């Protein structure tokens, strides 16, 4: 389930589909909020893929299957210089027998950085955590405490009155 | 080379040496070693893509946007041609240089 290639959608289909996935998760109040101001088939495929499971799709899964046309046109463009330079690099660079010494590899681990050879998934995200509800922002705007009396008045200080003679 | 660099830096850190030459030599060796490691790290970053995934970046940007709009932050504008404090900021910068 790793080798599967993304399908090359057209751009405005890709961005429109991408924009929908973000809005359904990080800006859930956007569609309703559009109405107060005034007053394609791809996204249908994504919903129908897992109609049984109500879990909305994520940004990663959308881009793990759907990719734009330029992001897929650029890949073939860059695959040519890699495959073209392969031939360029390979041309630029009784009885008894003779000595044999080691094995030769064009890329060393001493002069060039080597390759890689070593359940791995985590970091769930709360979408509601990314914004502040209007109800909460109302609460943290209301002054409220026990007012402490000033030490002195017009003439008691610390409560005990200033004594006259009379 | 690397073993000698390790040994001499540990000796310098403890405080066993007073040579100026040894300190300079070891500073050069460590600078070279750190630069080799850093160059490899940049190469690996280009190879292995952005370590922060798309989901993390979107969440970070969204939370920062919500925080900024909660405080009604007014974005900083480009310094206009008719800016009152241009000379004062300029003179402060020149003094610090």
């Amino acid at each position: 389930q790793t080798y599967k290639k993304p399908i090359p959608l057209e751009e405005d289909d890709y961005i429109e589909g991408l924009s929908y996935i973000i809005q359904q998760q990080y800006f859930p109040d956007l569609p309703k909020l559009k109405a107060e101001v005034v007053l394609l088939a791809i996204h249908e495929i994504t919903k129908a893929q897992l109609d049984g499971e109500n879990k909305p799709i994520s940004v990663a899964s959308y881009q793990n299957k759907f990719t734009s046309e330029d992001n897929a046109s650029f890949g073939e463009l860059m695959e040519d210089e890699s495959r073209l330079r392969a031939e360029q690099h390979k041309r630029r660079f009784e009885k008894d027998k003779s000595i044999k010494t080691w094995n030769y590899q064009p890329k060393n681990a001493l002069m060039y950085t080597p390759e890689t050879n070593h359940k791995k998934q985590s970091t769930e995200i709360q979408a509601d955590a990314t914004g502040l509800s209007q109800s909460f922002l109302e609460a943290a705007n209301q002054p409220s405490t026990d007012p402490i009396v000033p030490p002195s008045v017009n003439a008691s200080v610390n409560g005990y009155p200033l004594v006259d003679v009379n | 080379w690397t073993s000698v660099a390790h040994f001499n830096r540990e000796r310098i850190r403890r405080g066993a040496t007073v040579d100026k030459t040894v300190a300079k030599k070891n500073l050069g060796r460590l600078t070279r070693l750190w630069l080799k490691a850093e160059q490899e790290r940049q190469h690996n970053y280009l190879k292995d893509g952005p370590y922060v995934t798309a989901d993390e970046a979107v969440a970070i940007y969204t939370t920062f946007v919500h925080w900024l709009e909660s405080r009604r932050f007014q974005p900083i504008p480009f310094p206009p041609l008719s800016y009152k404090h241009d000379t004062k900021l300029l003179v402060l910068a020149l003094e610090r240089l």
Partner: peptide, 28 residues
């Protein structure tokens, strides 16, 4: 989203101001 919410907030403030104007006319 921010620009839409700003429009909605300013329009709700306009609603408050116009209804306050209506209430001040009604008190008269």
């Amino acid at each position: 989203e921010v620009r839409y919410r700003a429009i909605m907030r300013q329009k709700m403030a306009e609603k408050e101001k116009q209804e306050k104007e209506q209430r001040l006319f009604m008190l008269a």
